[PDB]
Structure 1
Amino acid sequence: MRWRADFLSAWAEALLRKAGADEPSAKAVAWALVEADLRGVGSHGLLRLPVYVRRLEAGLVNPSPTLPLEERGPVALLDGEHGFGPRVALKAVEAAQSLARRHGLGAVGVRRSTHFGMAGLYAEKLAREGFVAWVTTNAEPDVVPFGGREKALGTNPLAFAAPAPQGILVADLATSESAMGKVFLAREKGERIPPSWGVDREGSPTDDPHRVYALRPLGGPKGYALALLVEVLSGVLTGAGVAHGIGRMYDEWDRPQDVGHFLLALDPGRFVGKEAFLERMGALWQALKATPPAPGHEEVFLPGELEARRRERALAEGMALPERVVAELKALGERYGVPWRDDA
């Protein structure tokens, strides 16, 4: 069962306004979640709308932040004022590209934000402006450090993007084996998960998403190191919450999260040159596509390539949603007087 993305986008925005979010915030969230679904990244799509709205309802999210920005040369600090992550992140994107246009590069350290959805969306937006982009965000601890048995770091994802003649190369990855959102998606779809993703409360691997207590770092020490890099850039460096100091969106309803983000935009025009960069990216892209596939693969794909293909398809045939997610969205619609669209 597929749904009209444009209708769901309008619906989500309306529900958010009804819940109290101002116009730019409601649009930013509707955009971030639906865009994720379009690309086939359900872990960061409308599946998240219910908890996002509940956080607002509980008074843990700023519905209309001013978003103070302080510039210092090619560096800028953004105060999210506890606004919705997508709203905060989109302003960070604008600030980063503006700084890069003027100085050749721009770094934005964000504090007091909240879960911002798919990191790749922001990196992609920056790349569409002609910049090489690097975007990171920390999160409440859900992952054991390498060699440890208790949660110490968030899934702390990182995203990177760069323009190419063939399209936008976009990488989006949690530094743990898997993002927690994928565990949530499995729960909604009623599916088992790879047992290497996490362990139960007794430290044993489990393929039951409902029994996952903590996640494991990607490839042991390496994913652990990457999680720390993301933590330093997104949290320590910005003035935002750091690891255990970050409020848990799903478990702590006493105060705002204070999630931090880090965004860096680089102008290739200041390096090898804009035209040269694109031609070189094109040759790299071409080379990867020309690589003979491994068994079980029809061809090699660039990060973001399949996502772009899925988006086009979903915009034409509609986007899919798990029955359980729809049921929750319907209940949410009734709670806020913005009924699920029967024409969607």
Structure 2
Amino acid sequence: MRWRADFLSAWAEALLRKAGADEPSAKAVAWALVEADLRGVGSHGLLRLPVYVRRLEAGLVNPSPTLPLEERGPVALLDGEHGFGPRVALKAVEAAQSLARRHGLGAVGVRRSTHFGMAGLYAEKLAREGFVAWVTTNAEPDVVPFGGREKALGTNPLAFAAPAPQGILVADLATSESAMGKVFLAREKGERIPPSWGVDREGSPTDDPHRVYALRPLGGPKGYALALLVEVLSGVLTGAGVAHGIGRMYDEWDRPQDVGHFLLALDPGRFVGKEAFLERMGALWQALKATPPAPGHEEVFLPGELEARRRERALAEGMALPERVVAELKALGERYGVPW
């Protein structure tokens, strides 16, 4: 069976408000999770709602942050006050847009935030507003540094978006080879995993998901370097938590997380020009789409293109959700008196 995004979004918002979150926060979270599911990124979709609500219940998420903002020129610092990541991040997007419109560039350093879901959503929103956007967030350590055997950095994703005539280019990638969610999945299906995904407690690559102690960086040294880029911009520079100081959303419940985010919006109008940029992006997009395919492929796609086609189809015919996820959501709704 398939579900309607409008129904799921309204339901999620209603549930969150019943749980104590203010309207802006409830709307922001419903948006982030449902929009991720629409694009096929379920790892950051509604399956996260249950834990998000548990964190709120435990008093680890601010239900109504005022979101203090301080700006000077093209720079702004945002205090998330431990509010829901999507709520904090959308305010940062608003600030980045305003700053870039006035200064050509707009950088927002966010601290004291929490898990904000799919980084690409924020980058895409800024791009649809006409900006070239860069969005990063750090996360609790799950990845060993290159050459190490103990966790040092989170999956720390980097997202980058830019508008084109044919669509919105959206690069959104974790800096680790894989993700714990995929490892746990393999554990259930009793399948082997590529040794490139993780290492055992000794620090040696393993093809057994049951033996994975930590994730490995994408392409060895490079993914490790990229994870540090994300950590520096997201946590060190912002005043937020850094690595082990961030807080594990699933494992540590003694204090709120202190996730950091970094957002940068650039106005093409102050560079090559708004319309010129659009045309140039169009030429590049066209050239890529015209590229003859490699074996096993029918055509080349731009990052974010398949995600957009998936969202379009999901809006047109409904969204597919794992039976397990639906069960959890239904149970969550029932205990709060918000019928699914």
TM-score, normalised on structure 2? 0.96
Structure 1 residues 281 and 300, CA gap change in structure 2 (3 angstroms):
same
CA distance in structure 1 between the aligned counterparts of 2:188 and 2:68, rounded to whole angstroms: 38
Whether the 8 Å CA contact 1:189–1:322 is kept in 2: the answer is: no
Quote the offset at 1:339 in angstroms. 2.5
Change (3 A) 1:308 1:93: same
Distance in 2, matches of 1:187 and 1:323, equals 18
2:120 corresponds to: 120
* Native 8 Å contact 1:127 1:163 kept in 2: yes
Structure 1 residues 103 and 48, CA gap change in structure 2 (3 angstroms):
same
Helix, strand or coil at the partner of 2:76: strand
Q: Residue 188 of structure 1 contacts residue 324 of structure 1 at CA under 8 Å; is this kept in 2? A: no
CA, structure 1 residues 296+303, in 2 after alignment: closer, same or farther (shift >3 Å)? same
| CA displacement, residues 202-257 of structure 1 (integer Å, 9 cap, x when unaligned) | 54545565654311100000000000000000000000000111110010000011
Distance 1:57 1:292 in 2: 53
Q: Are the equivalent residues in 1 in contact too, given 2:74–2:100 (CA < 8 A)?
A: yes
Confirm or deny: 8 A CA contact 1:158 1:172 kept in the other structure: yes
The worse-fitting range, judged by mean Cα deviation, of 79-88 and 12-21 is 12-21
- Provide the rounded CA distance (Å) in 2 between the counterparts of 1:191 and 1:28: 37
My pick for the range that moved more, 118-127 or 329-338, is 329-338
Change (3 A) 1:320 1:205: farther
- Whether the 8 Å CA contact 1:246–1:259 is kept in 2: the answer is yes
Distance 1:191 1:159, change over 3 A: farther
Query: 1:160/1:138 Cα in 2 relative to 1: closer, same or farther (>3 Å)?
Result: same
CA deviations on 1:65-120 (whole Å, 9 max, x unpaired) are 00000001000000000000000000000000100000000000000000000000
**In structure 1, C-alpha distance between the alignment counterparts of 2:132 and 2:328, rounded to whole Å:** 38
Q: Compared with structure 1, are the counterparts of its residues 75 and 135 closer, same or farther at alpha carbon in structure 2 (3 Å cutoff)?
A: same
Contact 1:138 1:261 (8 Å CA) reproduced: yes
CA shift, 1:297, in A, is: 0.5
Q: Answer whether contact 2:18 2:336 (CA < 8 A) is retained.
A: yes
SS of 1:296's equivalent? coil
Structure 1 residues 123 and 190: CA distance shift in structure 2, 3 A: farther
How many Å apart are 1:201 and its aligned residue? 3.8
**Structure 1 residues 278, 214: CA separation in 2 closer, same or farther (over 3 Å shift)?**
same
Residue 80 of structure 1 corresponds to which residue in structure 2? 80
Q: Percent identity?
A: 100
Q: Which residue of 2 aligns with 1:280?
A: 280
SS at match of 1:146: coil
SS in 2 for 1:231: helix
Contact 1:189–1:324, Cα closer than 8 Å, also in 2: no
Deviation at 1:180, TM superposition (A): 3.6
TM-aligned CA deviation for residue 292 of structure 1? 0.7
- Structure 1's unaligned 5+ residue stretches are none
Contact residue 144 and residue 216 of structure 1 kept, 8 A:
yes
Q: How many aligned positions are there?
A: 340
SS of aligned partner of 2:182: helix
Matching residue of 2:50:
50
Give how far 1:196 is off: 2.3
User: Are the aligned partners of 1:155 and 1:180 in contact in 2 as well (CA < 8 Å)?
Assistant: no
Q: How far apart are residue 332 of structure 1 and its match?
A: 1.4
Bigger shift: 164-173 or 4-13? 4-13
Between the aligned partners of 1:187 and 1:51, the Cα distance in structure 2 is 21
Q: What is the Cα deviation at residue 268 of structure 1?
A: 0.5
Residue 200 of structure 1 and its aligned partner are, at CA, apart by 3.9
CA 1:119–1:150 in 2, change beyond 3 Å: closer, same or farther? same
Whole-angstrom CA distance in 2 between matches of 1:113 and 1:29? 13
RMSD: 1.7
Query: Cα gap change, 1:59/1:211 in structure 2, threshold over 3 Å: closer, same or farther?
Result: farther
TM-aligned CA distance change 1:211 to 1:82, over 3 Å? farther
In 2, the alpha carbon distance for the partners of 1:45 and 1:185 equals 16
CA contact (8 A) 1:44 1:181 kept: no
CA drift of 1:149 comes to 0.3
- How far did 1:336 drift? 1.7
Name stretches of at least 5 consecutive residues in structure 2 with no aligned partner.
none
Per-residue CA distance 1:31-61 (angstroms, 9 max, x = gap): 0000000000011100111111110011100
Q: Is the contact between residue 149 and residue 201 of structure 2 (CA under 8 Å) also seen in structure 1?
A: no
Distance 1:13 1:192, change over 3 A: farther
Q: Residue 9 of structure 2 aligns with which residue? A: 9
1:237-294 Cα deviation digits (max 9, x unpaired)? 0000001111100100000110000000000010001111000000000010011111
Q: Shift of the alpha carbon at 1:18?
A: 1.1
Q: Residue 189 of structure 1 contacts residue 323 of structure 1 at CA under 8 Å; is this kept in 2?
A: no
Q: CA deviation at 1:337?
A: 1.8
- 2:59 & 2:209 partners in 1: Cα distance? 29
Alpha-carbon separation, structure 2, partners of 1:338 and 1:182: 31
For residues 302 and 69 of structure 2, what CA distance do their matches in structure 1 show?
35
Secondary structure, aligned partner of 2:124: helix
Once residues 336 and 142 of structure 1 are traced to their aligned partners in structure 2, the CA distance between those partners, rounded to angstroms, is 33
